[PDB]
Amino acid sequence: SHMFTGLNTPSGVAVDSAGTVYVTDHGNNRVVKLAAGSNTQTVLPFTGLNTPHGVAVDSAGTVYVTDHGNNRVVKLAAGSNTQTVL
Amino acid sequence: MFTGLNTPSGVAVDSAGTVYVTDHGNNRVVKLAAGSNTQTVLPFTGLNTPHGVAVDSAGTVYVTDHGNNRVVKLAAGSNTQTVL
Amino acid sequence: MFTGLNTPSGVAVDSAGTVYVTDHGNNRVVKLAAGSNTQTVLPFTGLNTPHGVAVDSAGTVYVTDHGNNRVVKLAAGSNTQTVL
Amino acid sequence: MFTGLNTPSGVAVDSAGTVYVTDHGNNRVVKLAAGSNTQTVLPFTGLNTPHGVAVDSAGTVYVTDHGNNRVVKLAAGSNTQTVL
Amino acid sequence: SHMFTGLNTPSGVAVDSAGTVYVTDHGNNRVVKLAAGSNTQTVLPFTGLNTPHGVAVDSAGTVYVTDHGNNRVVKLAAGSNTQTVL
Amino acid sequence: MFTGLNTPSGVAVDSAGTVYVTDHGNNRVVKLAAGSNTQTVLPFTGLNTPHGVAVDSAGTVYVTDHGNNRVVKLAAGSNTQTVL
Ligand SMILES: [Cl-]
Ligand SMILES: [Cl-]
Ligand SMILES: [Cl-]
Ligand SMILES: [Cl-]
Ligand SMILES: [Cl-]
Ligand SMILES: [Cl-]
Ligand SMILES: [Cl-]
Ligand SMILES: [Cl-]
Ligand SMILES: [Cl-]
Ligand SMILES: [Cl-]
Ligand SMILES: [Cl-]
Ligand SMILES: [Cl-]
């Protein structure tokens, strides 16, 4: 327990079939994820964000985020370093 | 690709890969079907700022209507919303 | 079927069709089972504005506790939350 | 000096130095006079999430009632609001 | 009383020395104002807005608004039809 | 001109025409002095999402710190914040 660090007004949350939790850390302009049982979060490599607000994850582990200040939606496949703008 | 969004807020994705977004600054809910580049507006009515969205295994879409203090839902292929 | 909501924000639906809403202006999380007609207030404690909600296949509820800079989880049969 | 705030949103200050805050997660508006050490909850009624606040030179308080799609006002010596 | 019309999740509010009330009608992508005693609002001619969130008015009646989805602040002088981007 | 803002939220203006903005997506409060094209960051500390801002006749700046459930203030030319 108490394993996310440095959160600031988290907004969106999603959970996948492995129990990994995805959060839009809305005050910090980033999307973080925490595997089940894990002590250390991962910060997803979305680029160019202006306040991520909502997040969803599909059955293939693709992460979709609303980029509130950029009027767009972005997506990252599981383990990818290269987002796609929807 | 989504076009003309304004301060999108909520996002959901169904078992087929369709993406649903609450276009929170534009008073509407939009989707983008997997297999398609054409966004569609869902026929919700009477909205005052849709804020969050969810989709169930049957394709039913559930939206928080922030300014009406209610949750609205549309079944897959229905144009008739139900209020929860 | 939901009652007394105030600027609901987040919404999630599980595989049973239970709908979960963050009743953001009232500092609480509510759920309504598919086919039920009374809501249940989930026994989260110490919230400062639940904002978003998700639910896993086992019915564990995850909520962003916006003003406490934290994510809380509650198993469906539990009255004791865990902080993530 | 403010107590029990939950995701405060709006803030205003008048010519007397009284500070007014929309205590947005608790569905209420609070004020603290310059040099005082207890807050007063303003007697607005029927709010669904006060979001923004302003105050005129006569001390009349204006609040956006986000979930009721309305603006409410309360004179400093009054217990009865007006809807704009 | 009950003189604003068509509001949708109003957010920001401001009041000037004439008692005119200014509101960001955040769900409708517009800024409205209502003079004291008046039965009919005015809609200010800001352009290109992506969700106005906050509003202020100065002692000269110049209106300043945060354009949340455009990552900017805009201003309109009293009676003007031509905003300035700050 | 303001530069590098992210989802600005609150705005205030003082008797001199200085404009104060809560740069809500960037965890900071900025101002732009009348007579100047150079924005400055106010030395608030410990912020978790500043949401609203007000300024009094003495130039004191008051900010709602949304994620810390508090209001912070800075006197004109002070770098030492006080918590209300
Ligand atoms: Cl928010
Ligand atoms: Cl936001
Ligand atoms: Cl928002
Ligand atoms: Cl909203
Ligand atoms: Cl909100
Ligand atoms: Cl919020
Ligand atoms: Cl908010
Ligand atoms: Cl709100
Ligand atoms: Cl909002
Ligand atoms: Cl907003
Ligand atoms: Cl916001
Ligand atoms: Cl916020």
* DSSP state string for chain B: ---S--S---EEE-TT--EEEEETTTTEEEEE-TT-S-EEE----S-S-EEEEEE-TT--EEEEEGGGTEEEEE-TT----EE-
Residue of E58, E72, E76, E85 to mutate when probing chain F, most F C-beta within 10 A: E58
From chain F, pick out residues whose CB is under 8 angstroms from the CB of E26: none
Mutate to test the interface with E, among F1, F3, F13, F49 (most CBs of E within 10 A): F13
The answer to whether the Cβ–Cβ distance between C84 and A21 falls below 8 Å is yes
Q: What is the rounded CA–CA span in Å between residue B27 and residue C9? A: 14
Query: How many angstroms separate the most distant Cα atoms in chain D?
Result: 34
Residue E18: how many CA atoms within 13 Å on its side-chain side? 16
Radius of gyration of chain C (CA): 12
**Cβ pair D5:F56 closer than 8 A:** no
Tell me whether C66 touches chain D (CB under 8 Å): yes
**Both tokens of residue A37?**
């049982």
In three-state form (DSSP H/G/I as H, E/B as E, the rest C), the secondary structure along B37-48 is CCEEECCCCCCC
Name where chain E breaks: residue before each gap, C-N > 2.5 Å: none
D11 Cβ neighbours under 8 A, 6+ residues apart: D19, D20, D21, D22, D53, F10, F52, F53, F54, F62, F63, F64, F71
Chain E: residue nearest F8 by CA? Answer: E68
Q: What is the rounded distance in angstroms from the CA atom of residue B73 to the CA atom of residue C8? A: 14
Cα C41 to Cα C37, C54, C58, distances in angstroms: 13, 16, 19
Q: What is the dihedral of CA A33, B11, C59, B58, to 10 degrees?
A: -140
The Cα angle at residue D61 between residues D59 and D65, in degrees rounded to 5:
180
**What is the C-alpha to C-alpha distance for residues E48 and E45, in angstroms, rounded to an integer?**
10
Distances (CA, A) of D21 to D3, E66, F13: 11, 19, 17
In contact, E50 and B6? CB cutoff 8 Å = yes
D11 touches D20 (CB < 8 A): yes
Contacts of E51 in chain D (CB under 8 A): none
Q: Which among A42, A55, A50 has a CA at the least distance from the CA of A81?
A: A42
**CA–CA separation, F62 and F12 (whole Å):** 10
Tell which residue, A15, C28, C6, has the closest CA to residue E9: C6
Q: How far apart are alpha carbons D19 and D5 in whole angstroms?
A: 14
Instruction: With CA atoms as reference, report the closest residue to E47 among E10, E8, E83.
Output: E83
Please report the domains of chain C, with CATH numbers, ordered by start residue: 1-84 (2.40.10.500)
Give the span between the Cα atoms of F56 and D12, in whole angstroms.
9
- Residue F28 to chain E, least CA–CA distance (Å): 14
In chain F, the largest separation of any two C-alpha atoms, in whole Å, equals 34
Burial class (CB within 10 angstroms; exposed 0-12, middle 13-18, buried 19+) of B58: exposed
Q: How far apart are CA D77 and CA A6, in angstroms?
A: 44
With contact defined as 3+ CB pairs under 8 Å, the chains touching D are B, C, E, F
Neighbours of A44 (CB within 10 A): 21
Tokens of D30: 């609070």
Tell me if B25 sits within 8 A of E69, measured CB to CB: yes
The residue written with tokens 């934290």 in the block is C70
Rounded to an integer, what distance in angstroms lies between the CA atom of residue D53 and that of residue C13? 35
Interatomic CA distance for residues E4 and D83, integer angstroms: 9
